[PDB]
Fold this protein.
Amino acid sequence: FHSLRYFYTAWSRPGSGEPRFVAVGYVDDTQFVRFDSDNASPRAEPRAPWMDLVEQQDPQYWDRNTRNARDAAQTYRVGLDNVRGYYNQSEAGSHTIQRMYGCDVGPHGRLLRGYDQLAYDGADYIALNEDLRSWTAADLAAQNTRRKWEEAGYAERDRAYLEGECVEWLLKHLENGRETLLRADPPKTHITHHPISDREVTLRCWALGFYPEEITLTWQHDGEDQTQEMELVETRPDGNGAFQKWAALVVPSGEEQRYTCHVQHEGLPQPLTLRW
Amino acid sequence: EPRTPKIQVYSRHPAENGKPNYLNCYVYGFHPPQIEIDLLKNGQKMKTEQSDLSFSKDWSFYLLVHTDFTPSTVDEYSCRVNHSSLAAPHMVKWDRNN
Amino acid sequence: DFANTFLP
């Protein structure tokens, strides 16, 4: 399946200026949009190639999304003071509101899940339920928001976007961005070798330039899986729009040939098996 | 209560010398969002570009900071991160094979 | 498009 997701962060800056508001959109693992409220006359801006064509495909796209983000930044600067009062916090400290919303779509452009979720200082605050008719508030302070949103009928407007508009734009981005988004790039894999002592040696299994981010790297010894024994770094961006990961075992010297690295990724034909 | 940034320093492409490359400092898993990230050439600061702030499912932020860089057969590259979860800035050196 | 934003 494919997903369109937006990530909002807003935070107060006591003693330095107004609150800051940053928005980024993503189709799957590719960022296509940003907004930063700290620019003079902040505009929504393209972060992926196919977005430099939306101006001729939808002549109003930038103006209405700019407008939308600017109102969002204004709404949350007030939301920061509302929520701070809910928790009876002073104006001295900085605090953070985050929002994550978007849609998961399977084949034939059909909606799987919609979601809209908010965090305050990094903890769950309020979330739209899977049925998109209702809200879950994480604590008593967030029930202030729940009652407001329920009375005002906001879940229905959220559902309207998530079911109609979120889906339609996922499709448009997928199609207009076919070459970037619909690709699956295999990893480029190799094994390096570092000894530490004479009874032990580090074997590091590398995966470079793959898209999407989803990947599994597994080390086996004689077919028995070494997951509990290995060192996996968290998958990292390569900076060109793909990702890197490595897995490493420390193995008895001389026995290198009894360890295999299994690599699974969505655009490999078959899971690969590598040795040194 | 702040969340401490994890920090990876690496090169986009497997490093050979004479090749101008891209040095990445990827810092992730942290909170609150205010943070400072620089790359340093032999201890002295560089000029880089920084990704747009985003966050993961657990609400922790991640940033990528990157610049053009040319390796040497010996020369020293590091990334300095300051965050409220740290008593002072941390500096992590870019090494050969990680 | 961005969704609408609702006031906490």
